[PDB]
Design a protein around this ligand. Sequence first.
Ligand SMILES: CCOC(=O)c1ccc(OCCCC2CCN(c3ccc(C)nn3)CC2)cc1
Ligand SMILES: CCOC(=O)c1ccc(OCCCC2CCN(c3ccc(C)nn3)CC2)cc1
Ligand SMILES: *C(=O)CCCCCCCCCCCCC
Ligand SMILES: *C(=O)CCCCCCCCCCCCC
Lengths: 279, 279, 117, 4, 4, 135, 266, 266, 62, 62
Amino acid sequence: QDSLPDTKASGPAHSKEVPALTAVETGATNPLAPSDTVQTRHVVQRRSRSESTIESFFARGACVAIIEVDNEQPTTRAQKLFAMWRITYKDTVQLRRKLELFTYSRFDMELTFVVTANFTNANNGHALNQVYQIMYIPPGAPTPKSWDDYTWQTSSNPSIFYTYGAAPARISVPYVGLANAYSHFYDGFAKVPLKTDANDQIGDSLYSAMTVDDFGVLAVRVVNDHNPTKVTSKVRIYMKPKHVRVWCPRPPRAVPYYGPGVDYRNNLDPLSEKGLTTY
Amino acid sequence: QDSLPDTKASGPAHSKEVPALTAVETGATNPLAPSDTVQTRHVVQRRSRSESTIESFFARGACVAIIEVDNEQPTTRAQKLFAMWRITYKDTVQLRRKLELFTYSRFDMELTFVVTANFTNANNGHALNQVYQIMYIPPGAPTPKSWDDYTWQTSSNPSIFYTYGAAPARISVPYVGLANAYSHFYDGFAKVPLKTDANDQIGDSLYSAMTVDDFGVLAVRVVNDHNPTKVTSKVRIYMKPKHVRVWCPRPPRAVPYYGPGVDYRNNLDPLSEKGLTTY
Amino acid sequence: LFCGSMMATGKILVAYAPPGAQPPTSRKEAMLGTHVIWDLGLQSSCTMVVPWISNVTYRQTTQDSFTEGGYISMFYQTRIVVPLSTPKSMSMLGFVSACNDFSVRLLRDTTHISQSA
Amino acid sequence: ISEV
Amino acid sequence: ISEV
Amino acid sequence: DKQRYTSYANANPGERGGKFYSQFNKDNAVTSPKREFCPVDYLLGCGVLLGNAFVYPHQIINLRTNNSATIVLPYVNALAIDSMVKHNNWGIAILPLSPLDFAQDSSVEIPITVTIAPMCSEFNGLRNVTAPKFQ
Amino acid sequence: ACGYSDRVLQLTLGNSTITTQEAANSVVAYGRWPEFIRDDEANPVDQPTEPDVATCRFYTLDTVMWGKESKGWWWKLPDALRDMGLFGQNMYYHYLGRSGYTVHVQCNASKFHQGALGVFAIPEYCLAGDSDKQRYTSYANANPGERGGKFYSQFNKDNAVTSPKREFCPVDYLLGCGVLLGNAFVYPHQIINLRTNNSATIVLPYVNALAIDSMVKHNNWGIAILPLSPLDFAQDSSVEIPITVTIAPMCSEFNGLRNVTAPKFQ
Amino acid sequence: ACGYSDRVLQLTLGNSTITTQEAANSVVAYGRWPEFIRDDEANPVDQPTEPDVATCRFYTLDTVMWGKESKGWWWKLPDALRDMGLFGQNMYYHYLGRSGYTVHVQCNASKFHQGALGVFAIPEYCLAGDSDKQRYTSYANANPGERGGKFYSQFNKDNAVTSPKREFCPVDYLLGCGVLLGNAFVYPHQIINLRTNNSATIVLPYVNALAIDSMVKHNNWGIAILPLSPLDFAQDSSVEIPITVTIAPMCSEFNGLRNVTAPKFQ
Amino acid sequence: GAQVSSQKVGAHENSSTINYTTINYYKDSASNAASKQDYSQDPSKFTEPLKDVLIKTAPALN
Amino acid sequence: GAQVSSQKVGAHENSSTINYTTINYYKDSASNAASKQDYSQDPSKFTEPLKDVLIKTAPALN
Ligand SMILES: CCOC(=O)c1ccc(OCCCC2CCN(c3ccc(C)nn3)CC2)cc1
Ligand SMILES: CCOC(=O)c1ccc(OCCCC2CCN(c3ccc(C)nn3)CC2)cc1
Ligand SMILES: *C(=O)CCCCCCCCCCCCC
Ligand SMILES: *C(=O)CCCCCCCCCCCCC
């Protein structure tokens, strides 16, 4: 059973015990129930907090990234024959705000990949079904320079080979943090400037940033050789934190996000106008 | 449990036992722990070597081959209506180097086949879905001369019939070596030149090479009769060594590979410049 | 490993500084960190253990200030002293290996090998 | 089985 | 079954 | 405009501390950027609303009720130990929830004094001293 | 008790005895002593020849000179011993042969001499070659016999396409095979550091993917000796001291008897 | 058993380790190991500071050179360590401090070098001065810090009455204090005789008339190093070899905390 | 290795305790689905972080 | 013929020992997946191949 406490029958009172009076200066929230200040009946309470457990609150697949990749003739100017994405929950706002109700977290992660494609131009013949390679490149590993260079050999890096039209691809990732918990906030720096330094660039870091690559990138390409006609594809990544634990609650983000840090720029006015004595 | 040894609390020392001094000439690595040369606290060590077990190190599908095959009208000049590949881990560098950290090995092998295709020309109508035949031809068996000659009858040779668009094909192969272990290195020859020989070509062999065909070939063809319009297809083979055992460790390859043997040709300079007293 | 002649003597200081301060430019600064004063003699070789001292549970294999490991330095504690008719200059060889508490994770491809088109 |  |  | 750009020397006021502002004034001089924090009071200097800051460990000094506040703090971090020079664990924010007022004197001023004690302090990784450039 | 030491050893095999007053202990490769093929690992069904004391004994090869310019020396086994007494005869009269080895490298000098030799025992020591041509080193060149081969400070490609030398070109810092010398220490080894020791003693098991094999077609072990630290003495810029290699076959057995193999070595 | 010796030692305190292959055993001054103030001998009632590994470790002072003309060197404790890391900070932030010490003096040379250093640990090493003026040596001069002081073959009286130097004038054969050097052997000591040993190791207890005292006002021990026999080598009439002094505080404890002492050393 | 638990039955058919069966197919615990049977806790560390926690019928300040 | 083993649980849900089940569907052992439960060994054959292995607090050369 996970039902909430039953309301107790409470009668009139004329006493020296005063639950209604308190002192918020202490730092505590007054633990009152309706029976402390009004006459209450007995209610056998059946309601439950099942849907607000941490797991339940985060148990949903959220869109964290749209990676666009093209399949077309390799010309000699900047193309999209392959694409790379730094893994983060921060390119999107919705999940970012939910996770940020907490300072620290621990969880395994489920990544689900929805892949859509279409024809760019009116017509140059058609395309046979495409297979997509999604390669994870951990910090340190050789990054691709070309859509078909040796890095895609993926001999130790994990790769997914997705076939277009198949059920959306899915993998699970362990708790991979360098610390005992993921820090959603870091009041610090990766480097300290020292008096004995040559330039002062040497000790300069981004405020609140930890490692440079942090979790690595996902490299995406269409394994198919190009058709005459061009096909544009988009990979939508949905992430779900599972087997979650969170520490130290924080106030929700009240004004729009301005990049990876806590910075604000505009629309610093979240609250509507309402008259003090107007219901 | 597979966790590493806990660090022991170690205090000051004034003694005749000197762990810090040794003699590498003996051939041995000095077995020291931090507590042998500094004061240490007690640490209950939870870390583990689970991801560096031989199985874990090789437990990944690596790209060992790209076999290109065409489906088009049988003209009368050199075409690609079928293709053959000598089975080896050596046409690629990434897995080759990992396996070559060891002199001898034993394992079962998992082959996974990713098959992509596309249209060559702007347009001659379209193509109905293709079925690919991948026939293994063991050393000795009749090799195909034509894309549809009797050899493809495959009455005893193993063949895979892959349908385009289906989940990537997969098979497992046993430990098939003539010896009790696969030799990644063979300091020898398949023939000895003798004084009583007629020409000296008779006793000539390639250095480090064992059998001529060694493991045989994979023959690939598109079973479909040709459309008016041409379709080019590529079969990407991913191999994974499973249930692995390895013997005699070797230094990692430090300079670029020059074919199947240990030969080197250029970029014999792997090491960067760095000043002796520069951090 | 000291690969000098047996008649050659000397005392050397080898050290390790955990990250966060100025990298040691003098024996004086180096002395303050983890160190071994090696005395040359019949036992040819000396081992300094770099104890696992870190903030994070696991460091990165890539270069990164957030997960940095510190500095190793070597200095003369006294000096190399030889007699006459003895070579006054010689080589020192160095070796590295991991203590039994060492572990690694998240398998990746190495930057140390590649192949052209 | 483990019936909980 | 063989529970290990 | 520059995100995550506040310099170390500015992020770290030492004993002196920093201050809050009633509104956001963007450091305009692109040529020689001040690289400072601009903490707006009703946004708790970090983009959230002050009224919800009460979910953090806190007390209120209401002058009719009390002289002082006493908060005992554990070490809180994602790690058992860390670089104290690179990273601050706790922040102490003091804000006037209700403004100071006295009789009719429109220019009242009273002192606030902060006293702090380290507890169960332990250190690892000894070597030469860190000398941060604070200029 | 009494006065026994790591430094003082006596090795006796057959009618041969070695004494050393300055050793640095001794290595048993991979922790394995040489042993004979056990019935449950046997493959040729014919009763083996076990020559024992006549072949399992100390054969001393021709001495080499270590000088300031010496880049390194290498040998292959069984090849270095192919002409050594009755071992050689047994090797060539039988299709198959297996044998372990005790390797003893000797180099003395003086309290005032300086330098350090790295002595390595490598399983399957495949070496690199001459040319653009891959896997082209000829049998006669891959097999120097007792003479051994040498190392080079750099790769000189055999240029004469018309009449190719078909030799190995083993570059010292690449261990003659494309890897770095510093990592050669993962192989069974010892170091002769002149201030510390006269010699190296490495006991080798038979290592191969098979219980037994053709000794004429395939070498099992390679002995590579390199100057980790160069030879030096007082001020004499042209110092030279001898290095002598002595090897004993151990637990030697042979299968497949017939007429003798006569390899063309020209 | 195994192979342990008087000559080969390892000393480890905090994150510092010293190895020595040529020692002449080691001395524990007056047979007493360093220990902490016991409750039944305690005097300041306040809970002490015991910095342990951060202060009780090996601080190496600046090296001095021993040459044919060297008359001797001297140091005072705690003064020599006043600027050594966290020990120095603890010393100056507290009115009171007590500490024992491991003293390790280092001087290597060669089988063909010659000479002998007398290393003495003296309780209350009061030194003599400059002048006609008695007990006039200034604080800044009595306290050289890490640098140490030197000895002289004879007494030169500081003559300039108008602006007195206020320094010590320590004559070597009088142990710088009016007694004869030959009797200094009644003090805890060792001898570094170059044919016999590289170093000296003396462990010192806290010695004083009180359980604890002002480290800034009073030095407990003096380390005096003198050439009992002069340095000599082959025929080179200008030989010079280094002497390096390394010291570790032991069982250090402090009382009476307040703001830091900043002594005027100019 | 089958795992069996009781469902919390919300709307009931006109037909008691109902069960569901779970089996983990993968060695890595990360691969597992969510149990969703989770334990709740005291708000106290947040709602009453006091050194001397006082009882609601008594004066908060005494 | 079901095979049951314990997972090494890394991150834990707010919900003990967790299991997984394995069944081999093929006669050839080659067809089998990897157990990944593997035994570790001594570096000794590599790090200390000595005839007379000596103890670290004693002189390497005696
Ligand atoms: C501040 C940034 O966001 C986070 O804190 C954050 C974000 C994501 C998160 O997941 C871990 C990120 C690394 C994972 C993500 C994706 N991974 C893989 C692995 C293989 C494949 C084919 N595809 N993806 C494996 C590693 C953990 C933390
Ligand atoms: C030096 C070369 O590489 C190797 O040492 C090496 C490389 C691969 C390896 O696998 C064994 C090779 C033969 C196998 C490979 C493929 N096989 C099959 C069998 C049937 C089908 C349809 N497809 N493939 C069956 C036989 C074993 C050793
Ligand atoms: C415990 O699980 C033993 C009972 C197993 C009942 C049959 C399970 C069928 C599914 C097995 C999946 C195997 C996955 C490799
Ligand atoms: C041991 O395995 C007996 C229990 C079997 C439980 C049901 C297994 C269901 C899957 C059977 C696969 C058969 C493959 C031919």
